[model samples]
Target: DQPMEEEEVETFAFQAEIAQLMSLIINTFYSNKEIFLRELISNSSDALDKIRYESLTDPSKLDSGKELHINLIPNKQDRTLTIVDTGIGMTKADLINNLGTIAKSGTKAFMEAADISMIGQFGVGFYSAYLVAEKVTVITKHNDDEQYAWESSAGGSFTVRTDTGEPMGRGTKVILHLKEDQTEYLEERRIKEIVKKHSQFIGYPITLFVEKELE
Candidate 1:
C-alpha cells in the first residue's frame, strides 16, 4: 500500500491572513463574535414562526410541505458554515429591504398576521455575519417569489439574482465563508455550545451535524 504525501494539503490556504487582520477590525464593535450564530439562529426561528402563521391563513400555501426545522452544517475542509431553515424565506425585494437596506425593514408588516417576537428586527442584526465571515451568501425562497441568491462581502455592494442551481422548495440557506482567524466556528462542539447557551429559548428544532464513533 502506498501512502499519499501531505505536501499538497498544507500549501492550499495562503494569503487569507489579510482576512484575519480585517476580522480583527470588526471585532472592536462586536466584542462577542459568537453573536453571529446567536443572531442568525434567532432569525431562523422567526422565519419558522412566520411560516406557521402563513400556513394558518391558507393551507394551499404549503407548497414545500416539508417539515420546519433548522440545520447547521460545518465543513472544515471547505472552511464554510451553513445554516439552513425551512421557513418563510425572503424574496428578492425582501432581501434588499430586510438585508440590504439599513434600518428599513418590513418586520412590522407581518405582525398583523401573527405577533412574533422577532430578534432580528430592523435588519441590522443580519450584518453580524460579517463579524466572523469573509463573505456571506444567502439563498432564499418565498411563497410569493422565486428562489434567489444574494451574495455580499463586507464593505461591498451585494448582488442578487435568480437561483440557477437546484430549486429550493421554500426557506433560506445562509453560507458563511469563515475568516481565517474564525475557523473555530467550524467545530461542532463550538456551535453546539453556542446554540445551547444562547438559543435554548427558541421554539424550532435546531439540528447540527455531529460525528460519532461506532464500535
Candidate 2:
C-alpha cells in the first residue's frame, strides 16, 4: 500500500488577515467577478420566499408594493452596478456579520466543500458583489424593523448606519460601486446574459427599466 503524500491530504482555511483576503480579491477575482450578479439574484429570490413563508400567519407581512422581482442596473456613466430586490432587507447587525465577515456565506462554503444539500442559509450571496464593486451599499426595510443601510468597501470593517429617506415598502436593495476594470458589467447585454446563465429559473422575475435606441 502506498502512503498518502502530505500535499495529497492538504487542507486550507480562510486567511485570518483581512489585508491578505483583500489583496487576493484585487488581483485575482475580478476576472471571474461576473458571477457575483448571479449570486445576488438567487439570494433575492430566497429573501422573497422567506417572508412569503412568514406571511402564512400574517398576510400583511406581504407588502413590497411591487411584485417580488430582482433588478440589476449598471450605470456606465457612474461606473456602478446595482442589484435591487423587493425582498427581505437586513438590519444593522445583519450588515456587520454578513458584509464584514465570511461566516455568513453559504456559497463560499458550498463551493469549497462541494456540498449542495445545505438548507436555511443567508448572507453568502451579498459578499459576491465585492468582486465587481469597490464599495457596496445595502438598503433594507424589514417588516416591523427599522430601515437601515449597510455600507462596506472590500477593506476591513464596514459601517452600518440609518437612512432618512422614505422606507421602501418591505424589501432590500443592494447598490454596488463597480471598479474601473469591471466597467464592462455596466452593459445590458452582459448583465442579462449573466442573469440568464445563473438565475433564469430563480423564483422571481428579473427586469429593468431601460431606454432602447432605435436603429
Candidate 3:
C-alpha cells in the first residue's frame, strides 16, 4: 500500500459566519471557562454511546479492534491538552457547519425552548471546548467522513481541513491548547474531580491517557 501524500488530500474552508458567531459565543454565553472540559467529555461520551447502541444491532461494528474510551494528555511545553476518544466521527461539512455557525446546530431552538430532555439537542456542547482552550483541534475518522481535522482559536477565525495522517480506526480526538490562566485543568486530581462529579455514570468507560492505554 502506498502512503498518502499531502498533495493528494482535499480540505474544506470554514463558513464566514464562524468568526462573527465565535466572538459572540466566546464573549457571551461561554462565561464559565471550566465548563469547556465538562462539555467536551460529555460530547465524547455521547459519541461512544452511539456506537454502543449501533453494536447492539450489528456486532460487526464493534469488531474494529479499538476500545471505546476517552484520554486526556497535557503538553506542558506547548501548554496544550488533548481529549481523545474512539467513537463515531464526523464529516467535513459536519465540522464546517457544526463548528462555524451556532444557528445551524439544529438544537438551538429546542435548547432555547426549555427542553430538558434534549440534552445537547445541538452541537453547542462543543462550543464549550473553546472556553478552556485558546486553540482547539478536533481530529476524527468515521465510516462516512473517513478522517478529518478541525481546528480553531477562540478568536473569530477557524480552519476546517482534511486529515492526511493515520487515524485510530473510527473515532474522534479533541486537542485543547489551554490558556495560561486555565492550567489547573492539566492536573490529574482536578480533571478527575470534574469528571467524577459530572460524568460519573457517563454511560461509557472514560480514562486518563497514561504511558499505556486503559480499559
Candidate 4:
C-alpha cells in the first residue's frame, strides 16, 4: 500500500462586502467575548440535531457506535483550543456558503424550511471567534464526502483542501489559535465557568479536557 501525501490547497479571498462585515465584528463586538464559545457550541448542537432528524428514517446516515457530544480540548503549551463535535459535517460547498458569504435573509428562510434552529442565524456568529483568535481552522468530514480542512487568518481570505492527516470522522473540529491578549481562554477554570454560564443547557454533552493535578 502506498502512503497518501498532503492534498493541494486552494485559497480564495473573501468578497469585498464579507470582509467589511468581519472587520466590523472584530472592532465592535469585542465587548461580548464569551458569546463566541456559546455560539460555537450552539452551532455544533444544530449539526447534531440535523443528523438525528435524518437518521430517524434512514438509520444508515448515522455513524457507528458514536454518541453525539461536544469536546473541548485546550493545549496550553502550544496555545491552541479545539472544539470538536460528533454531528453532520460540512462539504466543500457548505464551507464556502457558510463561511464565505454573509446571509441577510437566507438563514431565516433555510431555518424555516429545514426545521432546524441555529444560533448562527445571521451567519456572523462564526466570525466572533476572531475576537480571540488570530487564526481559525475547521476540519470536517461529512458522511458523503472526504475529509477537508478550511483555514483562514481573517485577513479577508481563506483556504480549503482535502485533509491528508488523521480524519475526525463525520463531524466538525474547530481550532482557535488564541491571540496574545486572550490567554485567559487557556485556563481550565475560566473555560469551565464560561461553559457553565452559557452552554450548560445545550442539547448535547459538553466535555472539557483538563490536566490532572499532581499528588
Every candidate's lDDT: 0.72, 0.65, 0.67, 0.78
Give the winner by TM-score: 2 or 4: 4
lDDT of 4 at 148: 85
Write model 4 residue lDDT over 57-155, tens digit each, in one string: 888887532689999988877688889998988989899777875455543443233212232565656767887888999998889798889999878
Q: List the residue pairs that clash in candidate 3.
A: none
lDDT of 1 by residue, 25-127 (tens): 3555444678779788888888998898888988777878558899999888778999999999997778776665433333333222221223245344566
Q: If candidate 3 were superposed on the true structure by all CA atoms, what would the RMSD be?
A: 5.2
lDDT of 3 by residue, 1-215 (tens): 87555534333444444454445455554334665677778888888888878988988877653588887776666677788888777777667666664355444443344322233444466765655667888898776556777777765556666677666788888888876878888777887887777777776677775333344
Q: Is candidate 1 or candidate 3 better by TM-score?
A: 3
Judge candidate 1 against the unseen true structure and give its global Cα lDDT, from 0 to 1: 0.72
Best by lDDT: 4
Best by TM-score: 4
TM-score of every model?
0.75, 0.75, 0.76, 0.85
Candidate 4 TM-score versus the reference: 0.85
Model 2 lDDT tens row, 36-64? 77777777888888877777787776755
Q: Rank candidates, lDDT, best first.
A: 4, 1, 3, 2
